[PDB]
Design a protein around this ligand. Structure first.
Ligand SMILES: CC1CCN(C(=O)NCCCCc2ccccc2)CC1
Ligand SMILES: CC1CCN(C(=O)NCCCCc2ccccc2)CC1
Lengths: 193, 193
């Protein structure tokens, strides 16, 4: 039950490593999950719905990891605090590159996918701005740009930079350099006057 | 001749303000340009080719403005140098929001569009890195990150941040705040230790 659904999701994620969603059929998904095409349609209306569920799982995985981090402070410097946080996104999305790639592409065609990304990006920006605000309140960070606006640009940078690196786009920061690159820009822009 | 082509391009840019390329027909383009559908096909193979040409024009307009700026230094501080430069992109793309929007979407489906963006992003990153390198050589900027890697992330930030602002995406930096936001992050990350 859960098992056929889990199998469909696992098949989909595995096939997306090889080709885009356009080139994967419901027949491909059913076959891989060891069910028939009508049984597939019991669990999902479309292959598009399968992607949506896979992206939902990855975005929530990231969110829950960030929640964990937020509850137990690492006893470290400010640079390290930001690094550990960005690293949640690097490792989570970077562990699901095919879903990340397909999910990004689907924003163009899917209002539900567009709204899922938007919802979580708004949450992550809000959290970012709250931490900047806390750093300012304690006297560690200068009161420069509106914290929410700075947070916004820095999160959008990470979105575009991480995903270019993962996809091997030209241009991109090599994946082995992308965490240091982002952390630098975050720390200098947050603490810099 | 040039005139029918120019009319087709002008019609296309005007219709893209209203609806996406998917919802614009060759018949819509021909009618607007005051030609027949077969005469259209003399000038362009597809509506997709029309977009490609419009994007080519906008990207070259930006590039040529940056070339102009690069030839005649403004007698100003370092913050202002970066601002005037970023402003070329803000004003150029911001003056062609419908083409920018459609052109960004077309990267997913069009190898030629993907390669055009890539070509010019590589040029602009290279120029950025050259200016950072010059600032370091003169002793104004510290030798922190690899200049090309820093340049890369900052250009990708601008791409994603400007285009979210222009499209009124949620989340986005308000368009009236986006230049100050980007300039802050550029100057702090380039000059910060
Ligand atoms: C789909 C996008 C979402 C945005 N991305 C991303 O890296 N955001 C990073 C947010 C870091 C939040 C944080 C602040 C302080 C301490 C710990 C954590 C990139 C991926
Ligand atoms: C499609 C993208 C391309 C990248 N974008 C963008 O703002 N790049 C800014 C490059 C600024 C180069 C410069 C350096 C120093 C002095 C003057 C100029 C955003 C739009």
């Amino acid at each position: 039950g859960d098992d056929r659904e889990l199998a469909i999701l696992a098949t989909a994620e595995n096939l997306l490593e090889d080709r885009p969603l356009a080139d994967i059929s419901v027949d491909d998904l059913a076959k891989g999950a060891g069910i028939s095409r009508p049984t597939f349609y019991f669990y999902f209306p479309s292959k598009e719905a399968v992607l949506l569920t896979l992206l939902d799982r990855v975005v929530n995985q990231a969110d829950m990891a960030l929640q964990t981090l937020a509850e137990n402070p690492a006893d470290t410097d400010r640079e390290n605090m930001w690094r550990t946080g960005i690293n949640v996104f690097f490792e989570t999305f970077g562990s699901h590159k095919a879903v990340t790639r397909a999910g990004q592409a689907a924003r163009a065609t899917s209002v539900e996918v567009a709204e899922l990304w938007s919802t979580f990006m708004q949450k992550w920006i809000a959290y970012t701005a709250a931490v900047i605000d806390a750093e300012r309140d304690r006297g560690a960070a200068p009161r420069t740009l509106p914290a929410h606006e700075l947070a916004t640009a820095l999160n959008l940078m990470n979105e575009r930079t991480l995903f270019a690196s993962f996809a091997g786009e030209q241009p991109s920061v090599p994946e082995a350099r992308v965490l240091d690159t982002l952390v630098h820009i975050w720390v200098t822009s947050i603490y810099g006057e």
